[PDB]
Amino acid sequence: GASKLRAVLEKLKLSRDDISTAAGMVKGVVDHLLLRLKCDSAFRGVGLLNTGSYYEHVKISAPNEFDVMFKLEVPRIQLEEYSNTRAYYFVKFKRNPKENPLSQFLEGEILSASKMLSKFRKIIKEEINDIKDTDVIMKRKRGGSPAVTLLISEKISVDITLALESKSSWPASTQEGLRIQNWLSAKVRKQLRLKPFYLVPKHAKEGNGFQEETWRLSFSHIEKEILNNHGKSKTCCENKEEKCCRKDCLKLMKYLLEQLKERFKDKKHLDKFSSYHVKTAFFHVCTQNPQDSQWDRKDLGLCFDNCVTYFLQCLRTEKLENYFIPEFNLFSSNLIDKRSKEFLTKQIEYERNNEFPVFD
Ligand SMILES: O=C(O)Cn1c(-c2cscn2)nc2ccccc21
Ligand SMILES: [Zn+2]
């Protein structure tokens, strides 16, 4: 029902005002933090990376929650892949001169994530304590990559993550990734792959213990660009004759998962699932249907059923390739146990069989 779904989306559009006001409230604090952060010799080249659901224009239903990324430029780095993970790497440095301002964090030849995260939280703390014009508090440490967590005006929660920026060529694991050749063209793929890639501090788990000095690949900027320039036609969604329902589908998937996570928040089954899974699956569906005509607005129902159908498959086969790192499985049994996937499958299938009552 392309009408009921659009009723849901119209209902969703009402939150944009509050999400934008809160976004402004966040930006005000963030800019200050960055200006002050640029003072340290180590975090000199720190900058703001404007990516995420908000800048992708798909952020919904969470005004008091935000995620921001601080990017830092590392000139020349030698990357060492950790145990065929294809996504996690050790950061070494190409040259010998102590031009490196991060020499202080170098634990051996390998760059330590723990040390730099410590200095990051320390400086951020020292600076949030200084300003009293804005009621900003620093929350306790729980997460890994989203290392810093702030509370603005005792209302807004901001997840601050650190990211290294490398202008070098993308790692070999991304070779067969970003299959947009038949969709956004090969010229565009080449242009995009000429852009830098990022690394967020994350630990991998091979078993009982952890490796705490690893960095995981990040391409959020590429995701942003792909999302905000999503058509085979350059004038896609710029006129009435060329209006597609891609972003609508993504929004609907996100809302579906959100509602389902809210319905069973007390049972912890769906805790491991996030919106990135939905986004990834969506990108795969975009690759499957490269034509704008396959995303016509009038077919909003069908297209949505195409996305769900794919996502479900990913849940059943326990396979969801990272759109940039094909050999990395987001839905591997190591990451998410079968019981959770089967539960999510059960619920989604129920919803689809009862005309999505969760949409009302
Ligand atoms: O860090 C990011 O940019 C997002 N991301 C997630 C993820 C899982 S739940 C939210 N995000 N899993 C990944 C695995 C490999 C590379 C990137 C991955
Ligand atoms: Zn479009």
Side-chain angles (χ1 to χ4, degrees), residues 230 236-237 244 246:
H230 54 252
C236 183
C237 286
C244 81
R246 285 185 181 93

Side-chain angles (χ1 to χ4, degrees), residues 314-327:
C314 291
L315 289 167
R316 294 199 198 88
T317 56
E318 294 189 285
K319 289 180 148 205
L320 181 53
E321 304 181 345
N322 179 286
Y323 197 70
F324 307 96
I325 319 165
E327 289 175 293

Side-chain angles (χ1 to χ4, degrees), residues 143-144 146-154 156-158 160-189 191-204 207 209-211 214-239 241-261 263-265 267 269-271 273-329:
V148 181
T149 309
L150 303 184
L151 185 56
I152 304 177
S153 296
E154 302 174 355
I156 313 302
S157 293
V158 180
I160 304 186
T161 313
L162 176 65
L164 308 179
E165 176 190 285
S166 185
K167 298 185 192 291
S168 300
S169 309
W170 294 14
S173 61
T174 72
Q175 260 288 296
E176 306 304 319
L178 196 60
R179 287 188 56 243
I180 58 181
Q181 304 89 347
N182 296 323
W183 171 25
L184 299 175
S185 77
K187 182 187 288 284
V188 168
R189 192 183 184 270
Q191 293 169 0
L192 288 181
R193 283 189 61 96
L194 286 173
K195 288 179 181 285
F197 64 95
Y198 298 89
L199 289 136
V200 296
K202 267 264 168 56
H203 56 55
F210 279 86
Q211 188 87 29
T214 48
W215 300 76
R216 191 173 67 188
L217 286 173
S218 189
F219 300 96
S220 68
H221 59 308
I222 304 302
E223 291 159 4
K224 183 196 171 155
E225 291 192 35
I226 287 168
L227 266 169
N228 293 342
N229 204 342
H230 54 252
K232 170 174 285 308
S233 171
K234 300 179 181 175
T235 49
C236 183
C237 286
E238 277 194 21
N239 56 78
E241 189 74 57
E242 297 182 75
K243 228 83 190 175
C244 81
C245 64
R246 285 185 181 93
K247 270 192 179 173
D248 284 337
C249 284
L250 174 57
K251 280 180 184 92
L252 284 174
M253 290 295 293
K254 282 174 75 75
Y255 187 66
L256 173 65
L257 185 62
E258 283 180 19
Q259 291 292 90
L260 287 169
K261 280 170 73 67
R263 194 144 64 101
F264 310 96
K265 60 185 184 182
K267 246 172 180 176
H269 295 106
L270 307 174
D271 291 353
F273 299 109
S274 89
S275 63
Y276 186 74
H277 298 136
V278 147
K279 188 155 86 159
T280 304
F282 171 75
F283 284 140
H284 285 299
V285 176
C286 281
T287 293
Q288 297 181 328
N289 305 272
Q291 303 298 321
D292 292 333
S293 64
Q294 295 180 274
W295 294 89
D296 206 315
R297 214 172 170 266
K298 57 169 177 68
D299 304 314
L300 175 59
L302 293 163
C303 304
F304 176 65
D305 192 48
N306 292 341
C307 292
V308 171
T309 297
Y310 182 69
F311 189 74
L312 287 180
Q313 187 189 74
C314 291
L315 289 167
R316 294 199 198 88
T317 56
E318 294 189 285
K319 289 180 148 205
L320 181 53
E321 304 181 345
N322 179 286
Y323 197 70
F324 307 96
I325 319 165
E327 289 175 293
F328 194 88
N329 182 11

